[PDB]
Structures are given as structure tokens and as C-alpha cells.
Design an enzyme around this catalytic site. Sequence first.
Site, mmCIF file in Angstrom:
data_model
loop_
_atom_site.group_PDB
_atom_site.id
_atom_site.type_symbol
_atom_site.label_atom_id
_atom_site.label_comp_id
_atom_site.label_asym_id
_atom_site.label_seq_id
_atom_site.Cartn_x
_atom_site.Cartn_y
_atom_site.Cartn_z
ATOM 1 N N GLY A 158 0.761 -1.257 0.000
ATOM 2 C CA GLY A 158 0.000 0.000 0.000
ATOM 3 C C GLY A 158 0.788 1.301 0.000
ATOM 4 N N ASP A 160 -5.343 -9.066 12.260
ATOM 5 C CA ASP A 160 -5.416 -9.231 10.807
ATOM 6 C C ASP A 160 -4.884 -10.588 10.418
ATOM 7 O OD1 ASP A 160 -6.072 -8.413 8.117
ATOM 8 O OD2 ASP A 160 -4.067 -7.812 7.705
ATOM 9 N N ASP A 165 2.998 -17.031 0.631
ATOM 10 C CA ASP A 165 2.099 -16.989 1.778
ATOM 11 C C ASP A 165 1.156 -18.187 1.748
ATOM 12 O OD1 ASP A 165 0.629 -14.133 0.250
ATOM 13 O OD2 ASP A 165 -0.202 -16.114 0.134
ATOM 14 N N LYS A 192 10.870 -3.385 3.063
ATOM 15 C CA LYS A 192 9.587 -2.811 2.775
ATOM 16 C C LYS A 192 9.751 -1.310 2.796
ATOM 17 C CE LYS A 192 4.908 -2.601 4.989
ATOM 18 N NZ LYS A 192 4.005 -3.313 5.999
ATOM 19 N N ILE A 244 0.291 -14.809 6.508
ATOM 20 C CA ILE A 244 1.239 -15.794 7.020
ATOM 21 C C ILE A 244 2.230 -16.203 5.911
ATOM 22 C CG2 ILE A 244 1.355 -18.272 7.728
ATOM 23 C CD1 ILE A 244 -0.445 -15.324 9.394
ATOM 24 N N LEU A 245 3.507 -15.833 6.063
ATOM 25 C CA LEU A 245 4.515 -16.089 5.022
ATOM 26 C C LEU A 245 5.326 -17.316 5.358
ATOM 27 C CD1 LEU A 245 5.543 -12.339 4.745
ATOM 28 C CD2 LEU A 245 4.492 -13.666 2.935
ATOM 29 N N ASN A 284 10.570 -16.233 1.827
ATOM 30 C CA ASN A 284 10.643 -16.410 0.384
ATOM 31 C C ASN A 284 9.824 -17.572 -0.143
ATOM 32 O OD1 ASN A 284 11.615 -15.434 -2.040
ATOM 33 N ND2 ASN A 284 13.782 -15.800 -1.533
HETATM 34 N N1 LIG Z 1 9.416 -10.460 4.843
HETATM 35 C C1 LIG Z 1 9.070 -10.665 3.562
HETATM 36 N N2 LIG Z 1 9.745 -11.556 2.794
HETATM 37 C C2 LIG Z 1 9.387 -11.764 1.503
HETATM 38 N N3 LIG Z 1 8.365 -11.116 0.924
HETATM 39 C C3 LIG Z 1 7.610 -10.192 1.578
HETATM 40 C C4 LIG Z 1 7.936 -9.908 2.970
HETATM 41 N N4 LIG Z 1 7.058 -8.983 3.390
HETATM 42 C C5 LIG Z 1 6.245 -8.683 2.363
HETATM 43 N N5 LIG Z 1 6.565 -9.405 1.275
HETATM 44 C C6 LIG Z 1 5.863 -9.332 -0.044
HETATM 45 O O1 LIG Z 1 5.398 -8.012 -0.336
HETATM 46 C C7 LIG Z 1 4.006 -8.010 -0.588
HETATM 47 C C8 LIG Z 1 3.367 -6.745 -0.068
HETATM 48 O O2 LIG Z 1 3.729 -6.481 1.277
HETATM 49 P P1 LIG Z 1 2.637 -6.516 2.456
HETATM 50 O O3 LIG Z 1 3.488 -6.311 3.695
HETATM 51 O O4 LIG Z 1 1.764 -7.722 2.264
HETATM 52 O O5 LIG Z 1 1.665 -5.244 2.367
HETATM 53 P P2 LIG Z 1 1.925 -3.876 3.193
HETATM 54 O O6 LIG Z 1 3.061 -3.151 2.528
HETATM 55 O O7 LIG Z 1 2.068 -4.201 4.659
HETATM 56 N N6 LIG Z 1 0.493 -2.911 2.993
HETATM 57 P P3 LIG Z 1 -1.024 -3.781 2.990
HETATM 58 O O8 LIG Z 1 -0.637 -5.092 2.336
HETATM 59 O O9 LIG Z 1 -2.017 -2.936 2.203
HETATM 60 O O10 LIG Z 1 -1.394 -3.942 4.450
HETATM 61 C C9 LIG Z 1 3.465 -9.244 0.082
HETATM 62 O O11 LIG Z 1 2.305 -9.703 -0.601
HETATM 63 C C10 LIG Z 1 4.626 -10.209 -0.006
HETATM 64 O O12 LIG Z 1 4.546 -10.977 -1.204
#
Ligand SMILES: Nc1ncnc2c1ncn2[C@@H]1O[C@H](COP(=O)(O)OP(=O)(O)NP(=O)(O)O)[C@@H](O)[C@H]1O
Lengths: 492, 495
Positions: free
Chosen positions: A176, A289, A250, A195, A295-296, A247
Site C-alpha cells: 500500500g 489481521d 504466503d 519494505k 502468514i509467510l 521467500n
Molecule cells: N518479509 C518478507 N519476505 C518476503 N516477501 C515479503 C515480505 N514482506 C512482504 N513481502 C511481499 O510483499 C508483498 C506486499 O507487502 P505486504 O506487507 O503484504 O503489504 P503492506 O506493505 O504491509 N500494505 P497492505 O498489504 O495494504 O497492508 C506481500 O504480498 C509479499 O509478497
Amino acid sequence: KARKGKSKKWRQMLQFPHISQCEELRLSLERDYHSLCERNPIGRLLFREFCATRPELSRCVAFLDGVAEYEVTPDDKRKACGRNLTQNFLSHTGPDLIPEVPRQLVTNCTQRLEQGPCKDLFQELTRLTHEYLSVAPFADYLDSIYFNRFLQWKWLERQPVTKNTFRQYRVLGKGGFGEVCACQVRATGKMYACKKLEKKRIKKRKGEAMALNEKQILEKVNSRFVVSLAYAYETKDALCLVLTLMNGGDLKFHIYHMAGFPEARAVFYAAEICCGLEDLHRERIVYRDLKPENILLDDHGHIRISDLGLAVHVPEGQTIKGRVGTVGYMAPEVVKNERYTFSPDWWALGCLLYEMIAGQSPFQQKIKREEVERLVKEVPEEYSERFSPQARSLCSQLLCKDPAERLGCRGGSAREVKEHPLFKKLNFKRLGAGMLEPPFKPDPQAIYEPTDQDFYQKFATGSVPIPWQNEMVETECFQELNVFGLDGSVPP
Amino acid sequence: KARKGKSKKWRQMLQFPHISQCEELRLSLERDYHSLCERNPIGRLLFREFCATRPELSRCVAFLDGVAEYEVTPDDKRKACGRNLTQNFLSHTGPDLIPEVPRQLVTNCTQRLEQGPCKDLFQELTRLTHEYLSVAPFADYLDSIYFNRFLQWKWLERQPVTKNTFRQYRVLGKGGFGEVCACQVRATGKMYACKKLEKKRIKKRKGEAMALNEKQILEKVNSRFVVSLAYAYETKDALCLVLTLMNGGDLKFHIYHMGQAGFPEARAVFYAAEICCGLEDLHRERIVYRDLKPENILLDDHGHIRISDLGLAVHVPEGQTIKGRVGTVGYMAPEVVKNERYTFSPDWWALGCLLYEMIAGQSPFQQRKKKIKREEVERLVKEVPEEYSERFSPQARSLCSQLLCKDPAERLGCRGGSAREVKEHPLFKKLNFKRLGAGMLEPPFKPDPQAIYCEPTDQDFYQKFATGSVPIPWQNEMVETECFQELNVFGLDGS
Ligand SMILES: Nc1ncnc2c1ncn2[C@@H]1O[C@H](COP(=O)(O)OP(=O)(O)NP(=O)(O)O)[C@@H](O)[C@H]1O
Ligand SMILES: Nc1ncnc2c1ncn2[C@@H]1O[C@H](COP(=O)(O)OP(=O)(O)NP(=O)(O)O)[C@@H](O)[C@H]1O
Ligand SMILES: [Mg+2]
Ligand SMILES: [Mg+2]
């Protein structure tokens, strides 16, 4: 200046400061044994090395290692293991383990083991050992060369982090407020995810308080089952969170790329998330949430809780209010905008376990927000013969509609859940120390303005102590640079 | 509390102090690089370990080791050896050895070597290297963890020494003020000799100034060819000097235990060379020994000698001379028996006597068995040339006669070039003195393994005398016994 992944310049990047340069830093630091000698991974190792110089301190540490090992020792071998501990540290002819150890305590211990090798047995002794270590050995440690060495590592830990601490690699996904991409620390070779939140979009959507909240929560939490924040810094365009690299994709991806998981597998993930939730609730944090997308998986197939934007601290003795979360996963109390502490989370766990087995969400397929909310409040979830009885048992006890009676909220917290028969097969101590192999291993997927300036400074605090010190130990920078008196010792 | 020789308690006896305990000591100590980072053996090692962390500092040390090695390298191999050093530390494409090294200097070095691998070639570079190390690296070192460690070692060095620092073993011999016997340091296992002087006899004979003099000379001198004082302490009954243990007997014993008294040249020559080195080491400290004779040269287990018994030694202040008939009747030089003034020339004369006696099996002016009265000996010393036999090769006779020259102005060793005059005599043709000096030539004789087993004035004097551990021997002790390497290391133990 640019060009096992470590830079050729790594030794310089991590060159220790002068001792004098660590003086303010001494006086600045809090004199707390637990932090300095147990929690800070490097402080722990240096304290241990101090102890190794003296036989009495060294037997305490051996005993603490003895217990930690006994605690994660399979049920069949655990009695013999504890028998070994007593013979070696509680012998009536051996040296006293610590000063004024109450000798009735030791007799309790002897005979409590003889009937039941429960993992608590050595708790009082453990606690009296740390107590002893915390006073005089501690004071001596502080006035030893090993603490000078510690201050030197602490000083490195507190150095400015900029974009030039890392190499950036390919984008991993879009979030986002910015991208997420793979990065690597130049000094150590350790990979992370990075991020980015764009200062523009934060200021435009005014998500300052919320972005700061995610960061402060991530840094206070220290869990094998929640993504750790290693670093927090600013670019000229953005605020960054460097995070555990996950990696393996999710759970939304994994459930649906067939839909659903064999019991064994779904159970394993629920247990890990359960721990994650325990770790969070211990810190008085309600996640809010929990859903499969958040969950990754990592490269070995262990999971972590991700995206803590909706998390919040729940002050001691109070409740909080707020409809937030995703439509299908919000608990009855939440959809009714009632007050809660932790119950929402255990409800989500139920949905998530449900969805792992059923290949479907329990109240959502898409159906309109209203009717899903009515189903959640008023309608029992439906099970199929895809659920063994115990699966259905746990699920309904978690998807219990009244939070007072919901598993995980009846009074015993995460332990209620952990003790469900569905987990009969799993050893939580071992799971909690990462010693149980997951059933599934993923595919190796490739890699290659005064307000605002005030806010940026509160955010961009740099290295986070525990993950940072861990990073140094894991990559072997600690071992290679910490050592001393081996290098110019072999004569001419 | 009593029971590789090290006590089972050794780790506790050497347990390090707290850092705060080292603070006064920091400020107390003199901020001198040469001492802290070259002479003090443990300071040298720690400074080198500091250097090892940084590639630029560590190349300098590698260079200094390179040169040290080149200096002791036999004549035939020495050019290659130096070619190697150039290639590795003075390359026109390599990194500069030290900041602002003058490049003409390097050109002189390259080409000087190319014509003659003399052992001084790298002296200017060496000097410039220490010069560089002695400023910024040195300031960094001081402010590093490695100096903290030095201070902890120094503190151990300055701890009180008492009789409980050692175990005592059998008597070795009897000395004018007390016995000498073998002892061993409990913490390290290292053996020494221990010379006791009984407080009674010192006070009775008033030999205070002289006992103090011997001790202060011993502790200033640092020579592979002179007995070292490692500790000085007091008992309730005595003052003690703990000394390098020399167990192979003295030269008087060795010359005369045959039946047919004397040594083959090679052997006599080897001893002369080592003694000559000890005399150079003494004279560089402005000390004239004055009691050189065979009974005062001891042998160690391997058959290297050291000068012993420095009670008649005296410091000669810069530019002055001293006076005094002292010493043993048949080894005193003409100057001395005429009560004339001298600086260092008596010692070269005694060397001449000593070499003579080693070969002839007889002292040049006094007899072995039936002895000649003081006055006649003294007359022959002043007035009569010594007599040679076919037991002397021409060069032996040449050296002896040049040392037993009667006018000290023309005597070898005293014409102006000091010890180097003597060392350059052809008789020493075969011997490499740099190697000899670093202990690398095996002696021709190895002795028998000979067993071992089993008042305000005065208190002011006792305090001036019993100063405890002597730094350089002490720190050496810790290194040789491997207590340094085992205790000094860090970050391997609970890792
Ligand atoms: N620690 C991580 N390792 C690998 N991939 C990641 C990691 N964190 C996030 N991602 C990838 O980045 C994408 C987007 O980040 P994510 O954290 O899901 O959203 P956000 O930036 O927190 N904002 P929102 O998703 O709207 O709440 C995710 O769908 C993952 O595929
Ligand atoms: N370093 C040593 N190692 C082994 N034995 C030694 C050592 N020093 C002295 N001795 C023995 O102790 C004896 C007496 O010591 P010595 O130094 O000869 O006497 P002194 O008290 O100095 N008086 P004098 O020597 O007559 O001027 C020597 O002959 C040796 O037998
Ligand atoms: Mg997302
Ligand atoms: Mg004697």
C-alpha cells in the site's frame, strides 16, 4: 564505495572503535543483567566467555545449558537426561552449584524427577543460578575486558544505517505505501526483505501514526513466529523496514495453487501460528489481521506472522474498541463493535485452520459484507468429512461465537489451545525452538515539513539490537572479529 | 597453599585483575613506544596482535620480521632472501610500505643489494617503519582493547613476590653471603637459580652498597650472555636474587676435569666469541665487569655460556674514568695493578687471559697448582710477555697477544672500535656473530645432565633492594612457559 556475499571491505566496515569512543556509551547504558547477559545475543556470548575463565562460573553455565537441553529432550529420553544433570551438578559429594543453595530444594528435585521428568523440575535452581550470576559475576563481568569488547560491538550496532549499508535486489511485491524487495547487508552477507513506505504517500494518506505503530511493534516483538525488524532507516524518498526474508510464499497462495492441506500439514501451521499469537499476546499485542495472506513461509517451510499494520498494544487491565480487519475473518465481538482484548485472534486462528482443511473460508466464499457479518454472528460453520473429529473439535471451539467461552479466552490463554488433542503428536518446546521439520518444503524461488522531519527521526532509529546481534553471530562476523590473541602470536 | 611443573592452581595465581584495578597503573606508566611495543616482550606481542587487525600495520610487521630474518641468514642465501623482500615490500606497483617513504631511498636499497647483500641495507627503511609505527598506530594501540590487556599483564608483573611464589630445591653451591640453590616458579613451572644473601652477613660485613650494586646491574642488563635477574625479593632472613639457572658447570671445572687440561681451538674460540658478545652487551650499558675469569663463566644445559657473578662490576659514567685495584690476582690488567684509571680495557685483557688459559691449560701469569706470590705475578703482568707453545695456531696466538697487550691504548678492543675490533679478528673467520647473537649456532660441547630434586637503615635498604619481578625476564617467562598464549587468548571459550 560499491562493486559468502560479504563485501571485500567487510573487515573495515566493522572495524572496532577506540575504547575512549565507547565511554559515553558505557554511562548511557542501563545496568540490567537480564538484557546485557541473557537477551542481547552478543552480550550473552561475551558473558559466557567471561564465565569460561572461572571454573565456578563455568559450571553454572554448563548447568543452564544442561537444563535448556533437558527441556527440549523427547519424552522417552528425558528421565535419563535429568538423571545425568543431578549426578553432575547436585551430587551430595560434588561442589555446591551455587552459594547457599537450599539443600531441601535439591532433595525436592531429586525425588520429583524420580516420579515424573516434567520440564519444570529445574526451574527453581535455574532461577537461583541466574540470581547468583546477576550480582557479583555480573559486577566482575562489567569490570572485565569482555565488557569492553561488548561496548565495542554495541557501538557498531548504534552506527548510522543508510541505503549504503545494503545492496538492493529485485522487487518481491507491492505494498500500500511502496514496494517490498530483497536486499542484503554488505558487511555480513545476510539477506533480508526491505519494505519501503514512500514519504509522499504516508503524508498524503496521513498514515504516520499507523506506520510508526507497525515499526514500534515489530521492534518490541522478538519471536521465531513473527517477522523481525532488523533495521529501520530513511532514504530521501522513503522510510524502510528491513525484515526477515520470507521467500516461500504466503498461505493464500499455498492453499489455492492445487484446494486444501492434509491434516498433519494444516496442524503444523496452526501450531506455529499459535506460538506466534502467544508471543504477541505475551507482549500485550492483539494482531487483528490474521488471515492466510498474512502468514509467510520461509525457505525451510516454517511460517511467520506478517503485516502488523492493524496490531495494537492493549494496556494492562483495559480493553480496546474497533471494527478493523478483513470481512470474513473478523470475530463476532468485532463486527458488533464490542470491546475486546485478545479474543479476535483466536477466532481468526479457527478460521484459518478451517480454511486450511476445507479449502474455503468459513463465512465467505463473494457475498456482500452484511450477509457475511450475519453468518459470523448468527450461523454455525459447516463441516464435511474432510475434518477428523479432533480437527472439527478444535475449529468449533475456536469459532465459538461468545468470546468468554472461546478456546484461548477461557482463562489459560495459548496453553488451552496448545493442549487440544489435535496437537497430541507435537512437542511444543521443540517446535518453539525450531527443532521439528515442517511437512512441506517450498520451491527455491530465485533472487538477483517540521512535523514530518520530527516523525522521520522518531521512525528511523537504525539497527535493532537483538536481530542485529543475531545477524553478526549467524554470519560468523562475531566469531571471526571477536577473537583476540591469535593473529600476531606465532613468532616472526 | 602448597603440595609442565605448573601448580594445579596456576590459572588462579595468574587470574587477571579488574580493568578499574589497572587505572592508576595506566597513568603511572611512561608513554614510550620503544619500551611498550618493542622491548617489553608481552607489549611487543600485544602490539603485534593489534597490528594484525589492520592490513597496513600488519605489512609493516611482516617487513620487520622479514629484515630480522635477513639479518641472520647465512652469506650464501642472503641475496635471494633480500631480493624476496624487495619484490614483496618495495615493488614499484605494490602498495607503499609506509606513508611518504622517500623513493630515492628505495632506489638506493634496490641497487645497493644488487651489488652487496650487507646486513645494514634495510636499516633506513626499518628506522622509518618504527618511526611510523611509533606515532599514530601507537596512539591507536593505546586506546585499544589490546592495551587494556597489556595493563592487566603489567599488573600481574607488579604483584608482590615472596617465598611462596616459588618452590625451593637442592643447594647448588655456596656464596660469600649465602647459598645458591635451584628453585621453580609455581605459576609457570620455570626453573631458576636462587642466590641468597643473609641479612646478618650483609649487615655484619656492611656489603649493602655492593649487594645493591650487583642487583641493579643485573636488572639493567639484558643479554643472552649475562645471567639475568628475573626477581628480587626478601625473606625474613635474606635478600634473594632469582637468576637464569646455569647447570652445566663453570669453565674452571671444564678446563681442568680432563687430566690433560685445555680445549680444542674450535671450542675455546666458541666460548671466547660468546664472552666477547657478553662483554659488548655490558660495555654498551657502560658497565665494566672487572672479574672475568673461568670460574665466573657458567654453562647452561645446551653448552652456551653466560657471565656470572657481577659483584665487582661498576657503571662508568659517560666521559669519566674510574679507579681501583679489584679482581683476581692473575687476571687483572697492567693498568689495574698499577692503580691507574680505566674505563673498559681491563675486560679485554681478561678475555685474553681466558682464551689463553682455555688453550694452554694454564693461566698466563699465574700457575695452576703451586702458586706464585702476588708481587711476582704482578711483576710478570706488568713487565713480561706471556709464553706460547705449539698448542696455539698462529691466529690464536695473534688474538691472545693482541688482547694481552700491556698498554691499554693499543690493546685490541680498546683502539677505538670496541667489541667489533675483537669480533673481526681472523680467528673468528668461521663464525657468524649475528647468528651467535641470536642463539642459532649449536655449541661444540653439550654438558652432562646434572640432576635436580629433593634497623631503619636496613629496612630502608631492604625496600630499595626487594623490588620484585623484573619486567623483561618476567614477561619472557610468561611467553616461554606458554602461560601468555593460553591465558591471553579471548573469545574461544564459551563461543
Ligand atoms: N518479509 C518478507 N519476505 C518476503 N516477501 C515479503 C515480505 N514482506 C512482504 N513481502 C511481499 O510483499 C508483498 C506486499 O507487502 P505486504 O506487507 O503484504 O503489504 P503492506 O506493505 O504491509 N500494505 P497492505 O498489504 O495494504 O497492508 C506481500 O504480498 C509479499 O509478497
Ligand atoms: N645462575 C646460576 N646457576 C647455577 N648455579 C649458580 C648460579 N649462580 C651461582 N651458582 C652456584 O652458586 C655458587 C656460588 O655463587 P657465586 O655467585 O659464585 O658466589 P658469591 O656469593 O657471588 N661470592 P663470590 O662469587 O666469591 O664473589 C656458584 O659457584 C655456583 O656453584
Ligand atoms: Mg499485503
Ligand atoms: Mg662465588
